[PDB]
Write a protein that binds this DNA or RNA. Structure first.
Lengths: 17, 113, 192, 57, 126, 101, 50, 49, 226, 61, 42
RNA sequence: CGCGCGCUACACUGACAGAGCCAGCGAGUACUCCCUUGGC
């Protein structure tokens, strides 16, 4: 689930930016 | 043994005699043993099963080698012949009997021709 | 000849499975199955007592017709008899040829190609299948389809294997195998 | 997966521009590139982003 | 003097002694001939060494073979083995060793068991 | 009503009077393995004959009104010809090169 | 379709022998009780012996 | 009794008893042939009563 | 084409022997059935109303009646008289009941329940004069007997509304039809989805499985012209 | 509705897949730069061919 | 205690050959043979 | 009576007649299934 965790976090940070 | 910690890891076993010459396949998938129990032995270690495949030979083993292309092994046994195998399909693919191709002799106190 | 019977000395030339059938020009069609239907090496009968299952994928180095006979020796009343197994396959290949006048090896390999399903469901999603399991699955389906039709019927094991494999070669809708693959793949499409 | 790739690239660009844990950043950068060295030279929109990360790094 | 090669082959419990000397060319089993001794389907497995080797090799020598022990298919693999190790040993000891090594290449590259009684003992997954 | 062998010499085909036509293999002698049976006509067949070139096609003129070409591997007849009005009870293929089908 | 009539007992309970000939039935149930008596006495006798 | 068959050690013995009941009373019985071999009765044999 | 000679003898309509998958046909599955044993009688609301009202777990589920009448309907249906019909029952212990066409069950619930009890303790039901096991207990998966070329369908409420006649005409040339019908009284539709491709609603009304299967079966008899 | 040939180039271990499925990364036989990730059951080898049908989705777990 | 030392008694491992609904230890070897030995004494 | 554990039966992998062709372990002066009609 690990890379998936960082995938969603990446997605969230894109929305943040 | 583990390099990074040093304390012993695994005594592999299976051998009907002392183990004569050893090498890793250069990718690191396979450990190969040859022992004087007429036999050479494919130890796949880093797989999750730590499996073993035998290879019956004709006589004792003396030296092992790999190909940089890690598919092929070359084992040099006691009659003198080389036997050349492909690792995956554990089938012998080549052989050279080189006894007269290496005999040079007649030492001191060597009373055979 | 030293001592060799007449048909074999007549075909002293190259390899001929069963002393009747050639390996020379056999086409695969699925490039995914090329590596796994190993037919480059010949064999003379399919009873070649190699240890093709010590570790992984070496069952994909057995020549396929040995595998076919193997699958034939599978259910609880028919375990050991590999000799009856290759006898069955022998009679099957005679029948396939007499009904097709064709290279029955090319027939069989065609039947494997057309039978091997390509995606299946997992409890449920649907994923692709390895070519190795395509091969395995197809042989299993072919054999079990054959004997299951041969169950209480006068048509025996050889002839039902003959029919099932001819149909599965043809891809038509009358073989157990093609039907079962079709339903499996429709379930795969259904869930997707 | 590859859709996730260029956003990660932009994050690494931000990392290098505001540099921090720079060995980590270089390390994961090179991993991405080597494991997909073909698809990056297939795409186009990487180009400007890769120039940014080049200059910053 | 009179040439002789005496070879062994082996399987689970068959034992195949075979003697290979100069002669007309016949091939025999216990005192009966070759195409007859079998479970009558496996005679291809018997034929295989002659058919790899080409009979123009074999038309020099005579091959008695004895067998006992074990069931049919054991016996059969034994006989093919003693056939092969026979004819390669006779080529080793009474014609050119280069034809030995070329013959051994043909044989082994076909299969390994035709020269080596590579047996089955027990070693599962430990 | 007609029992004829394929130009191999290994196949005999023949048609009964209930309407089924059977095809079965024979070696030289005591071999009667019933390869296939077809049960389409429901009415006697009088002439089934092989195409003297192709091993897999055979004509079958039935009782009723019909002649038709079968392929051996096929489980339904390849082509069907009509036009006849009474029993049909003799037939043949056309020898000659351009006399193909 | 030529349908059929199921053969079955209305008064169903798992335990009870169902058979036409009460003679053979009583033979069976006598034999069963006899077996029970034999093994019961045997078990009691062995344990008394030990 | 008198022996019925004789294997290596374990010997069946027949004409001593009239029932398995009598035997399993004499379970573990200290038996002794004339020649002086000692021994033990262990189970009743089933098929000839 | 010739006009296809007229038969001079009436037809017997032998049903499909179970080895055959080839015959496009109709499979029905009374799923979610309530076939429960009591002491020795099926558990129903008739007498065990007080028992289940004392033990406080949904008196309304122990309804073997719906199964009985659905079965009776699908027995005396003329597609069953033709043999294009075969019945399977799933009861809530997970029991598969292969129901041959050639049976006639007695019409009443009491002889019925006695017969099902005999079933539930001998895994098979033999007939009077014929040796063949009339009602036969078999094993999940039901797919292990279902036809290969078919559409495992279930009726439902929230699914779209499609007319049965055009759906059975949508059914292909060689393909049978498998329907999962819910003999349960009150509950959701999830009882079969592990096999079912698609759920269907057939009318705007809410019904029972008896009229569901009768409408459905008569529609098949329409489209295959019985 | 085409069919696509593809080849497994590298087989993952630690995705946390469920049951007999493993994730794997494949490069297209057609556009040998385009590379995606799919899930698959059956013993499956590095550097080998696989047929697929739906070329749309990156597979989840 | 009586549970997690289950060998105070016997049960079948299977569960019932037939579920029947109307309203598990299978007897105790240890107390049984104990009571009996007291009787064989007395 | 409950309970499994072993043995038997249950059919297409059939039945009858032939033909042919293969094991390994076992040697205490020791080995027996009856029990009965007759007669010597």
């Amino acid at each position: 689930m690990a890379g998936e965790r960082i995938a969603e976090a990446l997605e969230l940070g894109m929305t943040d930016l | 043994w583990s390099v990074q910690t040093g304390q012993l890891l695994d005594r592999l076993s299976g051998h009907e005699g002392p183990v004569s010459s050893l090498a890793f396949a250069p990718d690191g998938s396979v450990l190969v043993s040859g022992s004087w129990d007429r036999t050479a032995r494919i130890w796949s270690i880093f797989s999750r099963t730590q499996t073993s495949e035998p290879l019956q030979l004709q006589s004792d083993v003396l030296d092992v080698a790999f190909r940089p292309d890690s598919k092929q092994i070359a084992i040099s046994t006691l009659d003198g012949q080389l036997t050349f195998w492909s690792v995956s399909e554990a089938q012998q693919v080549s052989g050279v009997d080189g006894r007269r191709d290496v005999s040079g002799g007649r030492r001191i106190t060597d009373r055979r021709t | 000849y030293d001592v060799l019977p007449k048909e074999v000395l007549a075909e002293v030339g190259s390899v001929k499975l069963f002393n009747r059938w050639s390996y020379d020009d056999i086409e695969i069609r699925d490039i995914s199955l090329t590596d796994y239907i190993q037919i480059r090496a010949p064999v003379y009968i399919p009873h070649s007592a190699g240890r093709y299952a010590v570790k992984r994928f070496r069952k994909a180095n057995c020549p396929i017709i040995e595998r076919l006979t193997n699958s034939l020796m599978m259910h609880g009343r028919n375990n050991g008899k590999k000799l009856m197994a290759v006898r069955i396959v022998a009679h099957a290949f005679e029948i396939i040829h007499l009904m097709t006048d064709q290279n029955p090896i090319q027939v069989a390999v065609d039947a494997i190609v057309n039978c091997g399903p390509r995606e299946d469901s997992t409890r449920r999603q649907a994923v692709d299948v390895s070519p190795l399991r395509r091969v395995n699955q197809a042989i299993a389906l072919l054999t079990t389809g054959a004997r299951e039709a041969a169950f209480r019927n006068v048509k025996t094991i050889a002839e039902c294997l003959a029919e099932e494999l001819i149909n599965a070669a043809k891809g038509s809708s009358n073989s157990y195998a093609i039907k079962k693959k079709d339903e499996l793949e429709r379930v795969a499409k259904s869930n997707r | 997966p590859f859709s996730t790739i260029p956003s990660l690239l932009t994050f690494l660009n931000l990392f290098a521009q505001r540099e921090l844990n720079v060995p980590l950043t270089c390390r994961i950068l090179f991993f991405v590139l080597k494991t997909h060295h073909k698809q990056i030279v297939a795409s186009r929109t990487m180009r400007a982003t890769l120039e940014k990360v080049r200059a910053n790094l | 003097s009179v040439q002789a090669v005496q070879v062994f082959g082996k399987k689970k419990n068959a034992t195949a002694v075979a003697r290979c000397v100069q002669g007309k060319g016949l091939i025999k089993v216990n005192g009966k001939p070759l195409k007859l001794f079998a479970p009558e389907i496996l005679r291809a497995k018997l034929y295989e060494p002659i058919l790899i080797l080409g009979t123009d090799k074999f038309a020099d020598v005579d091959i008695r073979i004895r067998v006992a022990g074990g069931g049919h298919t054991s016996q059969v693999y034994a006989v093919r083995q003693a056939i092969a190790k026979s004819i390669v040993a006779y080529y080793a000891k009474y014609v050119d060793e280069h034809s030995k090594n070329l013959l051994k290449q043909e044989l082994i590259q076909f299969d390994r068991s035709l020269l080596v009684a590579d047996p089955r003992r027990c070693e599962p997954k430990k | 009503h007609c029992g004829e062998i394929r130009p191999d010499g290994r196949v005999l085909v023949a048609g009964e009077d209930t309407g089924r036509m059977q095809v079965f293999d024979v070696g030289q002698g005591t071999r009667a393995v019933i390869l296939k049976t077809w049960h389409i006509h429901k009415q006697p067949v009088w002439v089934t004959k092989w195409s003297p070139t192709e091993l897999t096609t055979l004509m079958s003129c039935s009782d009723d009104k019909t002649v038709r070409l079968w392929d051996l591997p096929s489980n339904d007849p390849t082509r069907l010809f009509t036009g006849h009005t009474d029993y049909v009870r003799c037939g043949a293929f056309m020898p000659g090169s351009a006399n193909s089908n | 379709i030529k349908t059929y009539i199921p053969k079955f007992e209305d008064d169903f309970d798992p335990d009870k022998h169902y058979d036409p000939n009460r003679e053979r039935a009583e033979l069976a149930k006598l034999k069963a009780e006899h077996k029970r008596e034999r093994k019961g006495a045997l078990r009691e006798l062995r344990k008394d012996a030990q | 009794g008198t022996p019925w068959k004789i294997f290596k050690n374990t010997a069946f013995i027949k004409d001593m008893f009239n029932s398995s009941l009598e035997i399993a009373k004499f379970e573990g019985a200290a038996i002794r042939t004339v020649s002086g071999i000692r021994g033990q009765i262990k189970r009743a044999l089933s098929k000839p009563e | 084409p010739p006009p296809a000679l007229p038969q001079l003898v009436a037809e017997q309509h032998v049903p499909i022997p179970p080895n055959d998958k080839d015959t496009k046909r109709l499979i029905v599955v009374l799923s979610n059935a309530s076939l429960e044993t009591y002491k020795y009688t099926l558990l129903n609301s008739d007498e065990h109303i007080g028992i289940m009202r004392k033990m406080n777990r949904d008196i309304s589920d122990a309804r073997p009646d719906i199964t009985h009448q659905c079965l009776l309907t699908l027995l005396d249906s003329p597609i069953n008289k033709a043999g294009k019909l075969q019945i399977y029952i799933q009861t809530a212990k997970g029991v598969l009941i292969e129901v041959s066409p050639t049976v006639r069950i007695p019409r009443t619930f009491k002889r019925f329940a006695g017969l099902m009890v005999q079933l539930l303790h001998r895994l098979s039901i033999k007939g009077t004069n014929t040796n063949e096991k009339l009602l036969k207990v078999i094993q999940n998966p039901i797919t292990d007997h279902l036809p290969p070329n078919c559409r495992k369908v279930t009726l439902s409420f929230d699914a779209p509304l499609v007319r049965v006649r055009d759906y059975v005409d949508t059914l292909g040339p060689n393909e049978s039809i498998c329907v999962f019908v819910g003999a349960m009284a009150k509950g959701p539709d999830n009882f079969a989805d592990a096999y079912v491709d698609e759920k269907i609603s057939i009318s705007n009304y809410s019904l029972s499985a008896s009229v569901a299967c009768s409408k459905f079966c008569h529609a098949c008899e329409d489209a295959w012209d019985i | 509705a085409p069919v696509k040939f593809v080849k497994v180039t590298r087989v993952l271990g630690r995705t946390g897949s469920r049951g007999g499925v493993t994730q794997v990364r494949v490069e297209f036989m057609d556009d040998t730069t385009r590379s995606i990730i799919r899930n698959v059951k059956g013993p499956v080898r590095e550097n080998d061919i696989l047929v697929l049908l739906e070329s749309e989705r990156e597979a989840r777990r | 205690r009586e549970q997690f030392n289950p060998f105070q008694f016997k049960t079948n491992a299977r569960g019932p050959k037939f579920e029947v609904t109307t309203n598990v230890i299978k007897g105790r070897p240890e107390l049984s043979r104990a009571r009996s030995e007291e009787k064989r004494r007395q």
